[PDB]
JSON list of C-alpha atoms and ligand atoms in Angstrom, two decimals:
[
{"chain": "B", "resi": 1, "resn": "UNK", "atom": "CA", "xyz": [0.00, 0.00, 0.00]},
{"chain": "B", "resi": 2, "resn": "UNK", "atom": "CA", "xyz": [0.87, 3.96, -0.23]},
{"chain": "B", "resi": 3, "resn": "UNK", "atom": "CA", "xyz": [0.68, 5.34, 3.64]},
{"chain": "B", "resi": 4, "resn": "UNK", "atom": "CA", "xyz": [0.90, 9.11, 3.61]},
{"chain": "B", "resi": 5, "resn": "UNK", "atom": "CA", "xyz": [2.15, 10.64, 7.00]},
{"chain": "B", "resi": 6, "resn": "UNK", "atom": "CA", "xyz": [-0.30, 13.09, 8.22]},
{"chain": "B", "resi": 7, "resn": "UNK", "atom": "CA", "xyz": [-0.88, 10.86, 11.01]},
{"chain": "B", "resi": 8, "resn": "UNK", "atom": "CA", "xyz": [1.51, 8.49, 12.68]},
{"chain": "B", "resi": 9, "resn": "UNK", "atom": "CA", "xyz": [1.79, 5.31, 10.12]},
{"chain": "B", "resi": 10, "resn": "UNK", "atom": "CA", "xyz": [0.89, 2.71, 12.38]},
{"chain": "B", "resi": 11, "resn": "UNK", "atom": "CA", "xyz": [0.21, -0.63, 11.44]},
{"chain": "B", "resi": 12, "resn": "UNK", "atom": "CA", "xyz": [-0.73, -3.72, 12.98]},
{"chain": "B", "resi": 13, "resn": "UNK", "atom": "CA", "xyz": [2.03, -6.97, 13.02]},
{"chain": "B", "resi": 14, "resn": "UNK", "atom": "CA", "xyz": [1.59, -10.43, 13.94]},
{"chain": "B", "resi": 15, "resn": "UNK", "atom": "CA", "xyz": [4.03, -12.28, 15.63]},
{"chain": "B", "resi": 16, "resn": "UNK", "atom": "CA", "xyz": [4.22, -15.48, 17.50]},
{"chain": "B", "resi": 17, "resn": "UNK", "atom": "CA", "xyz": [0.49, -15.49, 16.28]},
{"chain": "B", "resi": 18, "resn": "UNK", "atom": "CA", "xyz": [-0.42, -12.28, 18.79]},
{"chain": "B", "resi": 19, "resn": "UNK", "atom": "CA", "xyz": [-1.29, -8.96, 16.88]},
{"chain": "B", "resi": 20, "resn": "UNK", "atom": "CA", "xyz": [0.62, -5.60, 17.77]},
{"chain": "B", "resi": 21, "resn": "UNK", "atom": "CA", "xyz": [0.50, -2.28, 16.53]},
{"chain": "B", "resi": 22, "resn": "UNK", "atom": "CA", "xyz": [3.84, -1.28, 15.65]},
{"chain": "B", "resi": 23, "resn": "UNK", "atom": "CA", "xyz": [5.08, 2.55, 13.99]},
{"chain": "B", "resi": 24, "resn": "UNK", "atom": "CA", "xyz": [6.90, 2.02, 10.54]},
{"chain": "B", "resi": 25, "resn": "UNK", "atom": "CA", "xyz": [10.32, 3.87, 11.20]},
{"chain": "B", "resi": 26, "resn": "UNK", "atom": "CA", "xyz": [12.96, 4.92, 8.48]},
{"chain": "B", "resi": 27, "resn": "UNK", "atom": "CA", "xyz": [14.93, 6.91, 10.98]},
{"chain": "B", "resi": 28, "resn": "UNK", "atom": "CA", "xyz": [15.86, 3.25, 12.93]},
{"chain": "B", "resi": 29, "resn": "UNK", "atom": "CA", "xyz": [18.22, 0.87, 11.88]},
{"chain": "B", "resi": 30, "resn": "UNK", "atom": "CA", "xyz": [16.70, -1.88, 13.82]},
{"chain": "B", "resi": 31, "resn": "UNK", "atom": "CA", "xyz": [13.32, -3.14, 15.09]},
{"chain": "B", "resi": 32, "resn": "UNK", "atom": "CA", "xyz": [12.65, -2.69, 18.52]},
{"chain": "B", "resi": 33, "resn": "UNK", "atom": "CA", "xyz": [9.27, -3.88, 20.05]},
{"chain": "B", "resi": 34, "resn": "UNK", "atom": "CA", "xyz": [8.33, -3.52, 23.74]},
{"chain": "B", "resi": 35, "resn": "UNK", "atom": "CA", "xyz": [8.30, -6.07, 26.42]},
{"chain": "B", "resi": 36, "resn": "UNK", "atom": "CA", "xyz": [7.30, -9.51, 25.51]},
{"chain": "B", "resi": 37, "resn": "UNK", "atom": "CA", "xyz": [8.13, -13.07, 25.46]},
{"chain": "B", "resi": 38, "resn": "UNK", "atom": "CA", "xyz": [10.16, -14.89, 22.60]},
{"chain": "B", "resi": 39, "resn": "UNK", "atom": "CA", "xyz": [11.08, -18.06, 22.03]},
{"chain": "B", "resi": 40, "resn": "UNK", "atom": "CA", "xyz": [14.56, -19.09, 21.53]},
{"chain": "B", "resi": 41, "resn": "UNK", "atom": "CA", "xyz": [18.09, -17.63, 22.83]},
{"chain": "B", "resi": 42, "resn": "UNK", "atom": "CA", "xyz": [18.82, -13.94, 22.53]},
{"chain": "B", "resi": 43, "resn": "UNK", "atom": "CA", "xyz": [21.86, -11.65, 23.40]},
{"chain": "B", "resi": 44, "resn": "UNK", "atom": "CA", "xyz": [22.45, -8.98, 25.49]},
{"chain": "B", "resi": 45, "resn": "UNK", "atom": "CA", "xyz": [22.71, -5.92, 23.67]},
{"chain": "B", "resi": 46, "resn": "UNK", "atom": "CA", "xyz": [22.77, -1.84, 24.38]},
{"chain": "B", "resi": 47, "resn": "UNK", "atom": "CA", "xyz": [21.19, 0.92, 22.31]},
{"chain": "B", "resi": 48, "resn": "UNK", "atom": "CA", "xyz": [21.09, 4.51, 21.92]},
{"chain": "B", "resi": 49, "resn": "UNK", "atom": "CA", "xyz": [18.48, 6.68, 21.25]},
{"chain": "B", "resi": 50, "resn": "UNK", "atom": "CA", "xyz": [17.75, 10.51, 21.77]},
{"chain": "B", "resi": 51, "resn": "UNK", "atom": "CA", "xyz": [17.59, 10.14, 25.43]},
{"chain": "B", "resi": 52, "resn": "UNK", "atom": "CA", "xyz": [19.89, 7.87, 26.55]},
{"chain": "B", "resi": 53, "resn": "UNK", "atom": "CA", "xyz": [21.10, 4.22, 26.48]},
{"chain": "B", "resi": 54, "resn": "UNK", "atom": "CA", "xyz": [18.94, 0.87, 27.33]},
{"chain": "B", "resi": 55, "resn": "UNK", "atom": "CA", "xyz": [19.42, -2.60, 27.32]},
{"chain": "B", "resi": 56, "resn": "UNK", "atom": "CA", "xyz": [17.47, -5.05, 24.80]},
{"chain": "B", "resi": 57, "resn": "UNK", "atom": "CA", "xyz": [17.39, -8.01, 23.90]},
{"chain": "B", "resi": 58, "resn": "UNK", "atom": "CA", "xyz": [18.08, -9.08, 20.62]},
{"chain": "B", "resi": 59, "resn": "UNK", "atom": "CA", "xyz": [15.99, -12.24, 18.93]},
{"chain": "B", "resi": 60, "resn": "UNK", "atom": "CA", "xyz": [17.40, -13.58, 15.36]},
{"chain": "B", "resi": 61, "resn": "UNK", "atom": "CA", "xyz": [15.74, -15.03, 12.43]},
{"chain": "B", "resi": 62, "resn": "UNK", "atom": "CA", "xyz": [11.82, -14.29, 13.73]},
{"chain": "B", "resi": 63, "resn": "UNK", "atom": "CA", "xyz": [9.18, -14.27, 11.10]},
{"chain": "B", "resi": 64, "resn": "UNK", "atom": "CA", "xyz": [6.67, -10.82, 11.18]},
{"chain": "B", "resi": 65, "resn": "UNK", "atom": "CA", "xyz": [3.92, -10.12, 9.20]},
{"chain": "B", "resi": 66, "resn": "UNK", "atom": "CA", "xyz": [3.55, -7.06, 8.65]},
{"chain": "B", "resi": 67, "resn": "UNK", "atom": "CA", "xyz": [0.34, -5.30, 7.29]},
{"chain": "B", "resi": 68, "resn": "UNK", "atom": "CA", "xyz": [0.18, -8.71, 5.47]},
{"chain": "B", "resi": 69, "resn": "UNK", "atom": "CA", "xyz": [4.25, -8.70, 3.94]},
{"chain": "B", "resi": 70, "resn": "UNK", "atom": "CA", "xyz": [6.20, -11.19, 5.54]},
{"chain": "B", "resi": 71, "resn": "UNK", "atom": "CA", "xyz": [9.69, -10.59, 7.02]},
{"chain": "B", "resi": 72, "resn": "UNK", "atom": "CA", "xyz": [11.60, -13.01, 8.88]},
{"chain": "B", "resi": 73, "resn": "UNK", "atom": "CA", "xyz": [14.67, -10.89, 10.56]},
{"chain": "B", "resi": 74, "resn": "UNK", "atom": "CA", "xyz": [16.42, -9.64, 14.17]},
{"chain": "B", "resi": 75, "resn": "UNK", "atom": "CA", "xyz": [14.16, -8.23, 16.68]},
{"chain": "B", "resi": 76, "resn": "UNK", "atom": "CA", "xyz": [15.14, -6.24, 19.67]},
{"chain": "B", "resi": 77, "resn": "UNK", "atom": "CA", "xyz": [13.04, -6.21, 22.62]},
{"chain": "B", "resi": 78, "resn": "UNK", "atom": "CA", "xyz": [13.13, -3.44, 25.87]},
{"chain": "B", "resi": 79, "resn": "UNK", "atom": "CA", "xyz": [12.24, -0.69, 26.95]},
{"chain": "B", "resi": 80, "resn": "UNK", "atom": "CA", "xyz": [11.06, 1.86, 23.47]},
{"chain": "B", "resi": 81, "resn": "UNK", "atom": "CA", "xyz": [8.51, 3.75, 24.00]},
{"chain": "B", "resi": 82, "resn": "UNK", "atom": "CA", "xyz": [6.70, 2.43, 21.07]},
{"chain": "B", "resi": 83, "resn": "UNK", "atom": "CA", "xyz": [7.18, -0.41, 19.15]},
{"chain": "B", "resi": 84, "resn": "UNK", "atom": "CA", "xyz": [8.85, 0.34, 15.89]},
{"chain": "B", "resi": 85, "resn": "UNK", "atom": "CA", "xyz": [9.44, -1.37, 12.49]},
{"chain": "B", "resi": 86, "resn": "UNK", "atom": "CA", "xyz": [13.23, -0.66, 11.55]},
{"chain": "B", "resi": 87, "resn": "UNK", "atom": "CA", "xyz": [14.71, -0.63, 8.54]},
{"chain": "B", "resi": 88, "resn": "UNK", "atom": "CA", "xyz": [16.66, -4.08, 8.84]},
{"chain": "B", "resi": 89, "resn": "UNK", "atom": "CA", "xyz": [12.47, -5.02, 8.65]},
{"chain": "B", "resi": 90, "resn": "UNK", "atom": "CA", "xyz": [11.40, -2.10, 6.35]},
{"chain": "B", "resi": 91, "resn": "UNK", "atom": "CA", "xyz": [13.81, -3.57, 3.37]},
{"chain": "B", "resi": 92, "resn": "UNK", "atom": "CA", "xyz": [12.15, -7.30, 3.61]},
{"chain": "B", "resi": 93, "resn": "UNK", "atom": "CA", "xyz": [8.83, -6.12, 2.80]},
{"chain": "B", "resi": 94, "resn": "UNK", "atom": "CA", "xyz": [10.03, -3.48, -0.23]},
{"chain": "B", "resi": 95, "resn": "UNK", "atom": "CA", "xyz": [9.64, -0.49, 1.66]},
{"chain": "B", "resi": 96, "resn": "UNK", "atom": "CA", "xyz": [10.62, 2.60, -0.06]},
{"chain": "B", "resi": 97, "resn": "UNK", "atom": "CA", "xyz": [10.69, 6.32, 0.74]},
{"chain": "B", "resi": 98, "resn": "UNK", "atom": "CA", "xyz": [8.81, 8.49, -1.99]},
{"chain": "B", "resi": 99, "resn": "UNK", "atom": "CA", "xyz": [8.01, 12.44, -3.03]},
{"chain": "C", "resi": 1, "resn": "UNK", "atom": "CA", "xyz": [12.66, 10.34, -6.05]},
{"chain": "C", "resi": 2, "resn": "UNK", "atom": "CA", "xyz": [12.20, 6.86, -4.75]},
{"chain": "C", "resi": 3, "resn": "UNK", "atom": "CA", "xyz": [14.88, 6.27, -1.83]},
{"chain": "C", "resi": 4, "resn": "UNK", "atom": "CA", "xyz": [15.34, 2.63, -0.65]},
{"chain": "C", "resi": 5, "resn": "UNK", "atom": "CA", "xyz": [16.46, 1.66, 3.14]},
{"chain": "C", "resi": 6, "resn": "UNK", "atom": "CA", "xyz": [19.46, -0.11, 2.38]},
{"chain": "C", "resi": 7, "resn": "UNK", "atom": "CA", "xyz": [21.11, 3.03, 3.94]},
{"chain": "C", "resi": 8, "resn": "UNK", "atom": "CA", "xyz": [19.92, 5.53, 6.74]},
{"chain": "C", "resi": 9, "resn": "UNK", "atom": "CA", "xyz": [18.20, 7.94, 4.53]},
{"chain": "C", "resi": 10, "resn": "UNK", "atom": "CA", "xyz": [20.09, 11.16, 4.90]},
{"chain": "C", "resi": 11, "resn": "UNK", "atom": "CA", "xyz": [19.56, 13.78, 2.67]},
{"chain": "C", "resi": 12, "resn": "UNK", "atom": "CA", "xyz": [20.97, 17.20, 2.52]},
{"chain": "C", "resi": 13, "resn": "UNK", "atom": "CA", "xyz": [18.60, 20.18, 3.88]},
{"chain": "C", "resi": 14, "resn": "UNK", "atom": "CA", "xyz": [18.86, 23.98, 4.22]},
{"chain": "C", "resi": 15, "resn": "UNK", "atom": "CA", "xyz": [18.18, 26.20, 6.87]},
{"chain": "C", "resi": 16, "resn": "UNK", "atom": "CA", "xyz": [19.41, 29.49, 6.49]},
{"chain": "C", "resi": 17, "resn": "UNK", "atom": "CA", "xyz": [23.08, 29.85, 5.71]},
{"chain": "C", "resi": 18, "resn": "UNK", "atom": "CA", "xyz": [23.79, 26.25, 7.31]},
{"chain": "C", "resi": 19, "resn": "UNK", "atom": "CA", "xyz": [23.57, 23.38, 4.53]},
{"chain": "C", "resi": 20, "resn": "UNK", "atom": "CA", "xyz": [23.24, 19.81, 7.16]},
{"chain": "C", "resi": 21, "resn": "UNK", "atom": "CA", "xyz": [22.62, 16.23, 6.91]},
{"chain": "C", "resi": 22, "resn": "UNK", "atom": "CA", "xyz": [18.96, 14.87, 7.71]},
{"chain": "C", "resi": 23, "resn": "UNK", "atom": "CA", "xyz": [17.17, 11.95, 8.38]},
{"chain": "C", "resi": 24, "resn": "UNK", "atom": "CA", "xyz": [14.17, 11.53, 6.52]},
{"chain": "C", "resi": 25, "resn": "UNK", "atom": "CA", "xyz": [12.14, 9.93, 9.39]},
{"chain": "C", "resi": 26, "resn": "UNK", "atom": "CA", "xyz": [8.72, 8.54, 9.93]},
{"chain": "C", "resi": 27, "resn": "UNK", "atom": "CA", "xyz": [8.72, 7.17, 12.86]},
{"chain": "C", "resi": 28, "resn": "UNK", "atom": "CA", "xyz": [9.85, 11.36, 14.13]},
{"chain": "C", "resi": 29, "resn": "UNK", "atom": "CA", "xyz": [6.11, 13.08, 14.58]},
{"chain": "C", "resi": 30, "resn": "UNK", "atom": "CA", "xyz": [7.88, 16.57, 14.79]},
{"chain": "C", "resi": 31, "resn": "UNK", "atom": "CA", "xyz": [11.59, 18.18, 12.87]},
{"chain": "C", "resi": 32, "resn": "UNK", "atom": "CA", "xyz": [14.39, 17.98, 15.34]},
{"chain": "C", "resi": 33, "resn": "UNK", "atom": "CA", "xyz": [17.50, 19.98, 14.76]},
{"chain": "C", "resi": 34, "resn": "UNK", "atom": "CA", "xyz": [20.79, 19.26, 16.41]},
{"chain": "C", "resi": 35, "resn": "UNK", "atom": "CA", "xyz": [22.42, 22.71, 18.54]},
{"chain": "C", "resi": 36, "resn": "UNK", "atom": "CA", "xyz": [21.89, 26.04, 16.49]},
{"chain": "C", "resi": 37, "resn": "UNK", "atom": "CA", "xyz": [21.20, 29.77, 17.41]},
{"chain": "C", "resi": 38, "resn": "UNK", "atom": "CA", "xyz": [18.28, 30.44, 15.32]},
{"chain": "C", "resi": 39, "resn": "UNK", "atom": "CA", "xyz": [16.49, 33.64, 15.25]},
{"chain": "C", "resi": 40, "resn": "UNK", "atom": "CA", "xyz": [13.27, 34.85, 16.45]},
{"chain": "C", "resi": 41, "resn": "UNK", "atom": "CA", "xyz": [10.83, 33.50, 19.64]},
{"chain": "C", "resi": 42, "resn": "UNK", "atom": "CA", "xyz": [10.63, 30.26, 20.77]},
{"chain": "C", "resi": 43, "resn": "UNK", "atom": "CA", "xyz": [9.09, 27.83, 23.28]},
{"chain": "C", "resi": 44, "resn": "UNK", "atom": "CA", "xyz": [10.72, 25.27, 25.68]},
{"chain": "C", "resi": 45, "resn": "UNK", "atom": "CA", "xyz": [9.78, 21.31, 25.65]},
{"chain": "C", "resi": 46, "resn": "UNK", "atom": "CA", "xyz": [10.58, 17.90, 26.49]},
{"chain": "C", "resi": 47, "resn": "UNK", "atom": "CA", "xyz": [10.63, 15.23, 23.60]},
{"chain": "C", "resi": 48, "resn": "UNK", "atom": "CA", "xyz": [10.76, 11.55, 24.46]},
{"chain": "C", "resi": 49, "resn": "UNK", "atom": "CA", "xyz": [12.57, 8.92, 22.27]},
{"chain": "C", "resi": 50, "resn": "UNK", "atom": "CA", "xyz": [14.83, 6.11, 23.40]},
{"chain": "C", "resi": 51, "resn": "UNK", "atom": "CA", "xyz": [16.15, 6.67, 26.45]},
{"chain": "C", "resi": 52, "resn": "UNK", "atom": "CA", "xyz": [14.42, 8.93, 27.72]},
{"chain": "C", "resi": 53, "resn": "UNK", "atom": "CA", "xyz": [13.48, 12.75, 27.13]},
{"chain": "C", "resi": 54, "resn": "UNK", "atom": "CA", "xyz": [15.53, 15.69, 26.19]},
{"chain": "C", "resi": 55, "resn": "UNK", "atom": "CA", "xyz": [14.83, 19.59, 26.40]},
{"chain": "C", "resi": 56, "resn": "UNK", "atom": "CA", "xyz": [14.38, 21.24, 23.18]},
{"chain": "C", "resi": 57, "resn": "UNK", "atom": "CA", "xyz": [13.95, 24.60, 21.77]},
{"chain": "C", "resi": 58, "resn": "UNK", "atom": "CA", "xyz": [10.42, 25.11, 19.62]},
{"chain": "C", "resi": 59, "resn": "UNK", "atom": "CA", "xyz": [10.98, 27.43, 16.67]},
{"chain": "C", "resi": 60, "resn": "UNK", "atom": "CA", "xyz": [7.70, 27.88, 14.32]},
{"chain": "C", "resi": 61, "resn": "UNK", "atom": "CA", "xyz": [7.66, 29.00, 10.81]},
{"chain": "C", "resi": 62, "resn": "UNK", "atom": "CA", "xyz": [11.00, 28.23, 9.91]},
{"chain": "C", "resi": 63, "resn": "UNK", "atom": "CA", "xyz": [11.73, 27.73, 6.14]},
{"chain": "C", "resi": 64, "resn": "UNK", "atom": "CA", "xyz": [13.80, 24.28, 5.51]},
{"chain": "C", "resi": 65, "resn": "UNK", "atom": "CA", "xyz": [14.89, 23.47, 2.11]},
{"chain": "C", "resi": 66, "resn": "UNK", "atom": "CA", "xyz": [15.28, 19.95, 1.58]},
{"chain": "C", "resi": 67, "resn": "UNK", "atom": "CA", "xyz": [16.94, 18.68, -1.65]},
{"chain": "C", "resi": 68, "resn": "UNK", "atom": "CA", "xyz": [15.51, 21.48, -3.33]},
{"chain": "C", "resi": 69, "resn": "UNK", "atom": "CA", "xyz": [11.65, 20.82, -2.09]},
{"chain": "C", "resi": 70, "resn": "UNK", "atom": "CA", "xyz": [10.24, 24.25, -0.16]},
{"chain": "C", "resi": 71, "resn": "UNK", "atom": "CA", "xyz": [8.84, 23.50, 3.20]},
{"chain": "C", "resi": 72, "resn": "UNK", "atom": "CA", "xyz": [8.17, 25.92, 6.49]},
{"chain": "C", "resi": 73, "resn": "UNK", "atom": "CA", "xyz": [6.87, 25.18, 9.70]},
{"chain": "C", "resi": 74, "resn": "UNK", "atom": "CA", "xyz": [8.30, 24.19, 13.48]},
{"chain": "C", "resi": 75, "resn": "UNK", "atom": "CA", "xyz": [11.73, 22.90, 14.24]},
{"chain": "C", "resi": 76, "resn": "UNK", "atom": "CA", "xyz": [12.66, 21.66, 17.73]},
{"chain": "C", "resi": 77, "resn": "UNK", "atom": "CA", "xyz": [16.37, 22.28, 18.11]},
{"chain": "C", "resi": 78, "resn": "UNK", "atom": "CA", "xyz": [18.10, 20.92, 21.26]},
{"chain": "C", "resi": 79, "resn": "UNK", "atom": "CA", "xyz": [21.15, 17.73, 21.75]},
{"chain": "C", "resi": 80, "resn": "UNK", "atom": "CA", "xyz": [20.24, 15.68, 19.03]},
{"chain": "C", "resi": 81, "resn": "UNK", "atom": "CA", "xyz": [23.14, 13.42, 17.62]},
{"chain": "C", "resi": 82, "resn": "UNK", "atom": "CA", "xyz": [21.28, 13.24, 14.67]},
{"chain": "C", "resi": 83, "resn": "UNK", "atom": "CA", "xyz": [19.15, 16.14, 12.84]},
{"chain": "C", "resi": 84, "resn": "UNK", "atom": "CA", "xyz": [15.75, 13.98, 12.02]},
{"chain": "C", "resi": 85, "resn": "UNK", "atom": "CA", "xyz": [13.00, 15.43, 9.69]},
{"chain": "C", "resi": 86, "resn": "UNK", "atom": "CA", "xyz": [9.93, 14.77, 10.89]},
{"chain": "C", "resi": 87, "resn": "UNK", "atom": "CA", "xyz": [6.10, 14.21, 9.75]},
{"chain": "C", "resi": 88, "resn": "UNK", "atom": "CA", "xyz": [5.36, 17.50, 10.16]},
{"chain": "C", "resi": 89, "resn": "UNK", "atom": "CA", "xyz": [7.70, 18.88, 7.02]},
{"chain": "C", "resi": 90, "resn": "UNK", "atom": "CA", "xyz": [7.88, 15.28, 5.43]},
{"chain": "C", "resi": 91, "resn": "UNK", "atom": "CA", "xyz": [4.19, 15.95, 4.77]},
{"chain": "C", "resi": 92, "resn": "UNK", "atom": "CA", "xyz": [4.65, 19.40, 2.96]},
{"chain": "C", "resi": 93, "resn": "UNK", "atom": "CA", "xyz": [7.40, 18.12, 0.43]},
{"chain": "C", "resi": 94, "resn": "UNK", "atom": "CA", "xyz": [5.26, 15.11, -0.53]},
{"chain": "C", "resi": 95, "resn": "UNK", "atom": "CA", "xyz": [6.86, 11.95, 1.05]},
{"chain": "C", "resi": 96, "resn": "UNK", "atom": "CA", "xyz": [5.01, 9.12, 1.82]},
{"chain": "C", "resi": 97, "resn": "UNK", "atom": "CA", "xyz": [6.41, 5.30, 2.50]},
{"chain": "C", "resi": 98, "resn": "UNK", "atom": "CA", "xyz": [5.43, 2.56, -0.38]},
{"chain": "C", "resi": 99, "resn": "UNK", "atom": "CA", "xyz": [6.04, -1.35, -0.61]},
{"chain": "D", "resi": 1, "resn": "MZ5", "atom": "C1", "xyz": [8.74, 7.21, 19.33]},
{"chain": "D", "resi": 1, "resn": "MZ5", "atom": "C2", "xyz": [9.41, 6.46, 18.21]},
{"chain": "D", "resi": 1, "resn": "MZ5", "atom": "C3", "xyz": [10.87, 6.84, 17.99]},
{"chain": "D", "resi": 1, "resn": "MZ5", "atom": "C4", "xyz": [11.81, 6.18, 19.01]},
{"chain": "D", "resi": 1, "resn": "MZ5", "atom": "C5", "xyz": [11.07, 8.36, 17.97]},
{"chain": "D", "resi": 1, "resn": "MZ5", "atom": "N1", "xyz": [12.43, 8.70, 17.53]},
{"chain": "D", "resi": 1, "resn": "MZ5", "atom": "C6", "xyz": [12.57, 8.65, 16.07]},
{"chain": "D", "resi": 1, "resn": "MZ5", "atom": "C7", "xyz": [13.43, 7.44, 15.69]},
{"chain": "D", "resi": 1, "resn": "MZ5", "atom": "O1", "xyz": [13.35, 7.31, 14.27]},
{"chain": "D", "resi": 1, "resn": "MZ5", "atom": "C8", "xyz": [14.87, 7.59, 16.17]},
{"chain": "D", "resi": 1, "resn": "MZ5", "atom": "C9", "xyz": [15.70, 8.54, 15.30]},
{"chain": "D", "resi": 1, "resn": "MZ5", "atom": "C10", "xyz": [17.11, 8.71, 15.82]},
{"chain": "D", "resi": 1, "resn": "MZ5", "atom": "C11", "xyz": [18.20, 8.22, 15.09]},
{"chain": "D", "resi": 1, "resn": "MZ5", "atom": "C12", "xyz": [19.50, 8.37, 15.57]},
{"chain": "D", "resi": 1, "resn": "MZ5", "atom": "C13", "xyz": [19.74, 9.01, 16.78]},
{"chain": "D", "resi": 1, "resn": "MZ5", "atom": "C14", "xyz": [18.65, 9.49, 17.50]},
{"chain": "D", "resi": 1, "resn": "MZ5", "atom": "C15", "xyz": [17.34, 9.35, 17.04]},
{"chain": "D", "resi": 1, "resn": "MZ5", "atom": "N2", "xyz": [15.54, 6.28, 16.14]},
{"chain": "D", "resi": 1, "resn": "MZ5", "atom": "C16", "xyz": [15.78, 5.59, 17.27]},
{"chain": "D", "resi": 1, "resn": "MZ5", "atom": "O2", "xyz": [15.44, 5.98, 18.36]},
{"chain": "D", "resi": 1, "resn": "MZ5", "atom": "C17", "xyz": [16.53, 4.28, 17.21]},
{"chain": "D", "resi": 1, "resn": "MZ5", "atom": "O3", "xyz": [16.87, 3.88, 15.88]},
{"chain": "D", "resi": 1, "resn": "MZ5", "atom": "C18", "xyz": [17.85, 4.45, 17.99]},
{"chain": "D", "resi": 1, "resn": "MZ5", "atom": "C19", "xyz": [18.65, 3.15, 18.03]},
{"chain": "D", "resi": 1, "resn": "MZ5", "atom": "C20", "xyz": [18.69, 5.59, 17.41]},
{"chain": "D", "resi": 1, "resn": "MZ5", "atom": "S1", "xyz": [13.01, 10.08, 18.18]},
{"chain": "D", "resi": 1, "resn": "MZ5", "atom": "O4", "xyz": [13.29, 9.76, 19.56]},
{"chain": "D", "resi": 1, "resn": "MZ5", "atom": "O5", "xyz": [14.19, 10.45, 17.46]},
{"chain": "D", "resi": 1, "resn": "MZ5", "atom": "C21", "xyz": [11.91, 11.28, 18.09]},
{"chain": "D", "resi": 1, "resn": "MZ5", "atom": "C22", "xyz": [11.91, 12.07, 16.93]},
{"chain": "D", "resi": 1, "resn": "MZ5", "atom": "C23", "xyz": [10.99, 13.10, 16.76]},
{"chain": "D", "resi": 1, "resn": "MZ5", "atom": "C24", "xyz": [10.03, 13.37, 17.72]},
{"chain": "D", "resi": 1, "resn": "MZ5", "atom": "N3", "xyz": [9.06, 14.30, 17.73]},
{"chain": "D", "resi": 1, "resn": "MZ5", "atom": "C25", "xyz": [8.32, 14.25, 18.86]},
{"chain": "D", "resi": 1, "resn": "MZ5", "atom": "S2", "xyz": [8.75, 13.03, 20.02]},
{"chain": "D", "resi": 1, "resn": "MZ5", "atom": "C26", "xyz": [9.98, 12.61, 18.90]},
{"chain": "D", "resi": 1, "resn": "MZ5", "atom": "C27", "xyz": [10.92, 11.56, 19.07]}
]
């Protein structure tokens, strides 16, 4: 789809078969989704935002659907105030930037 | 222009006499500016991203020229790493996300 940007462009994801609204985010390189349980092993890892530094945790190779394109890719979970679809996401599904 | 995500995507913008680096960002609701001494009245606030909030200075009806598109309207300025353009002016120079 075309998503304009007068308002926020939120969409909804599914993963691990629970929905989630989730902000599509060209200024992030990664994913990062709030807290929430994933399977598998994951590493400790810090990032760096406007504000300040947290701690995530960073889940590879898990499948999203999002708004109906599926990505399977690295997912960071902590403490964002949002959850937001980053770029390493935004390129699976053919997201492109356009004016 | 079509820009793909491959790469953060920066593009050149104008404000004034001072020719910067930007982040085209959607996931950014409002223009933040790293430190400058812009003139004219402005407002005090507290943005939140990751990490936490920082203080910023709110400047309205500033003109912005980004690769060579017109826009005007309110730039936060305060200690950004980054300078992010958000919704607010990504909306006047006709950018919207596609896949
Ligand atoms: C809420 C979702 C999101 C976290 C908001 N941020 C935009 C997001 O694209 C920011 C942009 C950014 C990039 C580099 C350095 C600092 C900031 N990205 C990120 O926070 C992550 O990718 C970090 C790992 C950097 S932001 O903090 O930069 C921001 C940007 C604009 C804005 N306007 C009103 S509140 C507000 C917040």
């Amino acid at each position: 789809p075309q998503i304009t940007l007068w308002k926020r462009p939120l969409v909804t994801i599914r993963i691990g078969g629970q929905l989630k609204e989730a902000l599509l985010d060209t200024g992030a390189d990664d994913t990062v989704l709030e807290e929430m349980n994933l399977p598998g092993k994951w590493k400790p890892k810090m990032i760096g935002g406007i504000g300040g530094f947290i701690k995530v945790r960073q889940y590879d190779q898990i499948p999203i659907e999002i708004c109906g394109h599926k990505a399977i890719g690295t997912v960071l979970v902590g403490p964002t105030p949002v959850n937001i679809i980053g770029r390493n996401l935004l390129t699976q599904i053919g997201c492109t930037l356009n004016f």
